[PDB]
Amino acid sequence: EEAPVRVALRVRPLLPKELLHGHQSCLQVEPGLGRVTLGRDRHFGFHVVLAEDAGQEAVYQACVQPLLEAFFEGFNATVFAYGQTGSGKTYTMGEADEQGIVPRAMAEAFKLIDENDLLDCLVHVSYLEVYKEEFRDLLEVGTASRDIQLREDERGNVVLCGVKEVDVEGLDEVLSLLEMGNAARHTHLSSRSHTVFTVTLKQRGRAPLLVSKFHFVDLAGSERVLQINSSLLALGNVISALGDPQRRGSNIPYRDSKITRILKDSLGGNAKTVMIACVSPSSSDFDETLNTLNYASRAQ
Ligand SMILES: Nc1ncnc2c1ncn2[C@@H]1O[C@H](COP(=O)(O)OP(=O)(O)O)[C@@H](O)[C@H]1O
Ligand SMILES: [Mg+2]
Secondary structure (H helix, E strand, O other), rough: OOOOOOOEEEEOOOOHHHHHOOOOEEEEHHHHEEEEEOOOOOEEEEEEEEOOOOOOOHHHOOOOHHHHHHHHHHOOOEEEEEOOOOOOHHHHOOOOOOHHHHHHHHHHHHHHHHHHOEEEEEEEEEEEEEEEEEEEOOOOOOOHHHHHEEEEOOOEEEEEEOOOOOOOOOOOHHHHHHHHHHHHHHHOOOOOEEEEEEEEEEEOOOOOOOEEEEEEEEEOOOOOOOOOOOHHHHHHHHHHHHHOOOOOOOOOOOHOOOOHOOOOOHHHOOOOEEEEEEOOHHHHHHHHHHHHHHHHHHHO
């Protein structure tokens, strides 16, 4: 009935391009100790640390599978990928073998539905982009931003008005929708916008209403030019508050951004949340890697 935000760090390999430009790793990663060392003497610990050799299935098992279980119990869940552009958020979240979190979680969801034969289940999905505090519905997109509203009901549940929700019965249908949403996003950068893929599960007793939501979010790139003036800083403020024993029982400032408002019922409290902080090990990215390590640390 209450749980901390779980923070996972994912370190990707140094990329060919980075190697060819003369860069080398500035991170020593110790997965079994749950920790990393930046440069010579900057040490950071996280709930889960995944090294460059951790494959997609390993990330999914470490970070996401336990959310999937709470989702079917009727808890809300979110997994978000955070980090600078180029760090591996999209690769990790898998919405665009090498398949990422979304296809694996959806594959498992439909198997669970098949297994729970005493429940009658309905699943629908929405797929939204947030850019400069305006929504675009990627499954419609003929939808004016002004016609999508984010509200909250009396029981604290987030209510979307004007967003397309599509019933799905299998992974094939989910993959098809993701392909079209991703096509629709282009015909403004993907690294300056957030995307939110929301899966809603409605379960009723007898013969395959408890309602839960699982959000999969691929956040805007965290890089900075160098107080709360950005959606990433609003999200960081919220997760900081939740992780702070003095602040966590006080008023959590969800209202500051659309991203924190849409996740309000699915971020800490009674919901289960995992942040996957993605980092480049490249020495060329030292400063942004430090920024992400520090941001992720504030959530613990
Ligand atoms: N864990 C990983 N293993 C191998 N390649 C990766 C990994 N993470 C990211 N990459 C690659 O690094 C590049 C940037 O990844 P991407 O997912 O686009 O990052 P972001 O979404 O954070 O900008 C892509 O070419 C991607 O294939
Ligand atoms: Mg990306």
